[PDB]
Amino acid sequence: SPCDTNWRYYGDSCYGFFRHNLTWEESKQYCTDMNATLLKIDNRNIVEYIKARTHLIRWVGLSRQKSNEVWKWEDGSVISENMFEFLEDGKGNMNCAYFHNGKMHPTFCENKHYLMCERKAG
Amino acid sequence: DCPSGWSSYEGHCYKPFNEPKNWADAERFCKLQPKHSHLVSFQSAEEADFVVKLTRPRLKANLVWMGLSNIWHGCNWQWSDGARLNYKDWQEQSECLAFRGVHTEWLNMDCSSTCSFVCKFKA
Amino acid sequence: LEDCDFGWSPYDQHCYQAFNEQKTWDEAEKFCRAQENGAHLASIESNGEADFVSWLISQKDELADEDYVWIGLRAQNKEQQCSSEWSDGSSVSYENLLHTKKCGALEKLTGFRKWVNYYCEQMHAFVCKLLPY
Numbered sequence: 001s002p003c004d005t006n007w008r009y010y011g012d013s014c015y016g017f018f019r020h021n022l023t024w025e026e027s028k029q030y031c032t033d034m035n036a037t038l039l040k041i042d043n044r045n046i047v048e049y050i051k052a053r054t055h056l057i058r059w060v061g062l063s064r065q066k067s068n069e070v071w072k073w074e075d076g077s078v079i080s081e082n083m084f085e086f087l088e089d090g091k092g093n094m095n096c097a098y099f100h101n102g103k104m105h106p107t108f109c110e111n112k113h114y115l116m117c118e119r120k121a122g
Numbered sequence: 123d124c125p126s127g128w129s130s131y132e133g134h135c136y137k138p139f140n141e142p143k144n145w146a147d148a149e150r151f152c153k154l155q156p157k158h159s160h161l162v163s164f165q166s167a168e169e170a171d172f173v174v175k176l177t178r179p180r181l182k183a184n185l186v187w188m189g190l191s192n193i194w195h196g197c198n199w200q201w202s203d204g205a206r207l208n209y210k211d212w213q214e215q216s217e218c219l220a221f222r223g224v225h226t227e228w229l230n231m232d233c234s235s236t237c238s239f240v241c242k243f244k245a
Numbered sequence: 246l247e248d249c250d251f252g253w254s255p256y257d258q259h260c261y262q263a264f265n266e267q268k269t270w271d272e273a274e275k276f277c278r279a280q281e282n283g284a285h286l287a288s289i290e291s292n293g294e295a296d297f298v299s300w301l302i303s304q305k306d307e308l309a310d311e312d313y314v315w316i317g318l319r320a321q322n323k324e325q326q327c328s329s330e331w332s333d334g335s336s337v338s339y340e341n342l343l344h345t346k347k348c349g350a351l352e353k354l355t356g357f358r359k360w361v362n363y364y365c366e367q368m369h370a371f372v373c374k375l376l377p378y
Contacts, residue, residue, distance in 0.1 A: 017247060054248045055258060056377055114248075149332055163331035166339050189332035194346055194362050197320030197327035201288040202274055203374065207318075209290050211360050219326075228341050242333070 002121040009121055010049055015039070016117045017054055024096035027059045027115040028074075036117035037061060040073040041099065042080050050116075051102040059115045062087075062097040062104060071097070124245065125157060131172045134244050136162060138180040142236035145218040148187045152241035159241035161189035170226045173240060181223035185231065187239035190219035193230060248377050256297045260375040261287065263314065265307045267368040270348040273315045277373035286317030287374040289360075298372055299357040308370055311353065313363060315371035318349025320362075 003009040007016045022030060031038050038061030041047060061074035071079045071087065079087065087097070090106025097104045098113050124135035135157070143151060145161075152159040164170045177186055194217055199207055218233040231237075246255030253260035268276060270286075277284040289295050298316075302308055320327060325342040348365040351357040351372075 019248060054246060056248045160331075160333040163333050163335060164339055164341070165335070167341075170339075170341065190326070190328050190337075191332065193326045193328045195327060196329065197322060197347065197362075199318060199349070200321050201285075202317035202319060203283075203285040203288050205288045205290060209292075211289065211295060211358065213355070213359050213361060219328075226341060228343065230346070 007119070008053065011046075012121050014119045014121050015050075015053070016119075017058065017114075018116065019056070019114045021112045021114060022059075023112060024059050024063065024109040027113075028061075030115060031117040034117060034119075036119045037074045039099070039116050039118045040075065040077075041086070041104070042073070042077075042083060044082075044086075047086060047102055050099060054116075055101055057098050057100045057113045059113050060097055060099045060104060061118075063109070064095050067093045067095055128157075129176055130245065132169065134242055135159075136173060136176055136240055136242050138177055138186070138238065138240045140181050140184060140238045142184070142238060143187075144236055145187055145191050145233040148239040149189070149191075152239070155241055155243075157243050159243040161187055162240040162242040163189045167226075174221070174224065174226055177221075177223040177240065181238050183223045185220045185229065185235075185237035186223055187237060188219050188221060188228070189242075191216065191233055193217050193219055246377065253375065254301055256294060258376070260377055261298065261301055261372060262375075263302050263305045263308055263370060263372045265305065265309060265311070265370050267370060268315070269368055270315050270319065270365040270371075273369075273371035273373075274317070277371070280373060280375070282376065282378040284373045284375040286315055287372040288317050295358050298351070302351070302357045302372065311370050313350040313352055313361070313367070313369040314357060315348070315350050315369050316360070317374070318360060319365070320347040322347055 001009055003014040007014040040061055062071055064071050086104055088103050088105045094106035096109040097106050124130045128135040128137045149161050216233040217230045220229050220231050249255045249260040253262045274286050277286050325340040330336050344364045346362040349360045350363040352361045
């Protein structure tokens with residue numbers, strides 16, 4: 001309804017899925033180039049929608065500003081306690097996460113993956 | 123040699139029948155012959171040449187059953203991508219093989235059609 | 246899904262495309278491989294996918310008044326025909342074939358769902374299947 005071409009409307013957001021194979025930071029840059037944000041996943045409901053939409057590895061907006069620190073979304077909020085069930089195993093120096101088939105996985109930020117962006121529906 | 127009505131070739135006895143039967147009825151007709159017999163089989167070009175030589179007076183041109191049924195059943199069917207043929211959605215049709223009373227070429231036909239046939243047994 | 250290339254339609258973990266160009270089965274398979282990553286003539290592994298492939302084709306208007314549509318089924322084989330013994334029980338030695346029906350297709354008259362063995366060297370439209378990538 002309020003969303004544009006290549007952006008899907010769900011809840012109060014517009015979601016864009018882009019098959020550009022980019023590093024985490026490059027993906028972040030791509031999103032704000034479109035006045036958008038890498039995705040925030042703070043509930044089970046959005047998990048199921050996203051996994052419906054795609055089954056390819058895509059970066060999300062979850063990262064830890066330094067190795068071994070807490071996991072935070074783009075907006076600076078920390079991943080909700082309920083959402084730890086959806087964050088898979090990683091190493092201390094894997095700082096950024098991708099989403100794949102309903103789970104988030106910590107991995108090296110310099111690796112390349114496809115991405116997705118989110119804007120508030122207007 | 124071969125009973126009356128039957129022709130000899132290469133140790134076997136052959137008989138054409140010009141009366142249209144489906145493949146299944148034809149095979150059993152042969153079975154139920156006084157000398158138990160089966161639809162003619164071909165093991166060589168020469169034997170095929172002999173059988174059409176037999177057919178020609180008698181059965182020209184009728185389609186004639188030979189002893190091959192369900193010719194597209196047990197093929198090793200496979201997906202080109204190498205995925206398992208687990209789910210199956212076939213049709214509903216059975217093909218059998220025949221030839222014209224006049225040439226050696228084979229023809230695939232619906233088994234429920236009706237033509238003529240040749241029985242064969244070992245002497 | 247949605248993570249398909251333009252021209253391709255998602256369904257369930259795969260991308261699909263019916264091409265209206267008429268090719269022999271082999272030419273169709275080669276064409277599909279050459280829309281690489283590893284694309285192949287379609288495999289149908291379920292009722293839902295059969296329904297999907299059928300809907301995909303019906304949807305292509307350029308398709309066309311078309312009798313058959315190649316899918317990736319082919320017999321392996323190896324003889325000239327698949328019945329390995331004569332009715333007398335002996336094995337099939339000499340064979341006298343002629344065009345043979347060792348490739349599978351979907352058919353207009355059968356709603357592009359039920360499979361028909363058909364002659365491999367007949368030119369027809371086809372559907373390719375791909376794994377997103």
